[PDB]
Design a protein around this ligand. Structure first.
Ligand SMILES: Nc1ncnc2c1ncn2[C@H]1C[C@H](O)[C@@H](COP(=O)(O)OP(=O)(O)OP(=O)(O)O)O1
Ligand SMILES: [Mg+2]
Ligand SMILES: [Mg+2]
Length: 380
DNA sequence: GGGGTCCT
DNA sequence: AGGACCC
């Protein structure tokens, strides 16, 4: 049996901004990227603003909305890493999911604490936060005890995140990653909940669409929908044989297990990132001249990042998106270029990126690009 | 939107 | 190199 916590920061980008400019802490705030409000603080959500909503919709429904620009992710990324490092201090196995979510495997920590316990104050063990579905605790049930100690650790985590980084968030504690992530959002914002095993089925059947299961995305949901599968129960009861043939043995067996609340995937230590990338989207790029300036701009940003990181990238990738869905070209970085960080690495790197660009884009015939991205990977 | 992961 | 997933 495992004890897993999922930590999910409240309106992360908005929190980072409200900390940067505390004069926003009291007003409805929205963080904008191009024409989207990607996230907003809880005051704005109260005024009917939704995640990933159009700035037109948002401006009309809530003309008092204060917008800050969140296209440069630098500060969010930096705070994101402070959070996971703080969690890694609790237990070293921490898996990041995007910038604002972490899983921690607490089972070793829980076991250590229980061993230190006397029967005197084992009486006595208490929950911190909400119990999912108001389920009764059985102090004689060792699984219940282990999960409650988890909720205590989770509370210490949220307290340290607030006290040391100024950030609030939710936590969900359960026996695997799927359930911990489903349960962490039951009470929001800035609260936590623990899932006892006999409420597992209640949690999974509380979902309304199979897309709400982590692991089942747009494409997979579409296939399932095609098969007449709509509820969690539908997926639970659909023919394994048929499903296996429709989506392949790997996806079928995995997602069908997910529909019963079963997930044996380990919490993986994320550690340092395996790639660095920067991108810009735009309405139109139809010339190599600006394509180069664009790319130079991105390359500038990236180099600062590999600079302070330490490790060195052994491959570059250039990515594009044409009008009306992405294409990419990569190649190893010349060994001599790799030794760069106090000379002029720009020019030779731009040279390589442009060769890659022309290989993928016919510059002798009109082109219409709508995104450019540069990615460094294969770090050593 | 502006990132990131892993598998095939 | 592309596809699928996550935020
Ligand atoms: N398709 C997408 N789904 C989810 N998030 C996305 C997507 N595209 C970009 N993002 C970015 C923008 C959001 O600010 C952030 C998602 O954070 P998420 O944990 O879903 O909620 P949140 O931190 O905004 O608020 P809360 O956790 O309080 O609901 O990631
Ligand atoms: Mg969040
Ligand atoms: Mg999903």
């Amino acid at each position: 049996s495992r004890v897993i916590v999922h930590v999910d920061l409240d309106c992360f980008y908005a929190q980072v901004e409200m900390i940067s400019n505390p004069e926003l802490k009291d007003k409805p705030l929205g963080v904008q990227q191009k024409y989207l409000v990607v996230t907003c603080n809880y005051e704005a959500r109260k005024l009917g603003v939704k995640k990933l909503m159009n700035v037109r919709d948002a401006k009309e429904k809530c003309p008092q909305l204060v917008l800050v620009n969140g296209e440069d992710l630098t500060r969010y990324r930096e705070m994101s890493y402070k959070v996971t490092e703080l969690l890694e201090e609790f237990s070293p196995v921490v898996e990041r999911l995007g910038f604002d979510e972490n899983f921690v495997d607490l089972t070793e920590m829980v076991e250590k604490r229980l061993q230190q316990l006397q029967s005197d104050e084992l009486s006595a063990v208490t929950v911190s936060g909400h119990v999912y579905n108001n389920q009764s605790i059985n102090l004689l049930d060792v699984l219940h005890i282990r999960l409650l100690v988890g909720s205590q650790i989770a509370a210490e985590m949220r307290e340290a995140m607030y006290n040391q980084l100024g950030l609030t968030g939710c936590a969900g504690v359960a026996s695997n990653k799927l359930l911990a992530k489903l349960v962490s959002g039951v009470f929001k914002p800035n609260q936590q909940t623990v899932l006892l095993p006999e409420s597992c089925q209640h949690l999974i059947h509380s979902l309304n669409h199979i897309k709400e299961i982590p692991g089942i995305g747009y494409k997979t949901a579409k296939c399932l929908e095609a098969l007449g599968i709509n509820s969690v129960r539908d997926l639970q009861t659909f023919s394994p044989k048929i499903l296996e043939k429709e989506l392949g043995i790997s996806v079928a067996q995995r997602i069908q297990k997910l529909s019963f609340g079963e997930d044996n995937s380990p919490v993986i230590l994320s550690g340092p990132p395996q790639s660095f990338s920067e991108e810009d989207s735009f309405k139109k790029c139809s010339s190599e001249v600006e394509a180069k300036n664009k790319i130079e701009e991105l390359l500038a940003s990236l180099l600062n990042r590999v600079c302070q990181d330490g490790r060195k990238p052994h491959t570059v990738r250039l990515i594009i998106r044409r009008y009306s869905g992405r294409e990419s070209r990569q190649c190893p970085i010349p060994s001599h270029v790799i030794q760069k960080l106090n000379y002029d690495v720009m020019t030779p790197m731009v040279d390589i990126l442009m060769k890659l660009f022309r290989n993928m884009v016919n510059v002798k015939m009109p082109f219409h690009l709508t995104l450019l991205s540069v990615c460094f990977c294969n770090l050593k």
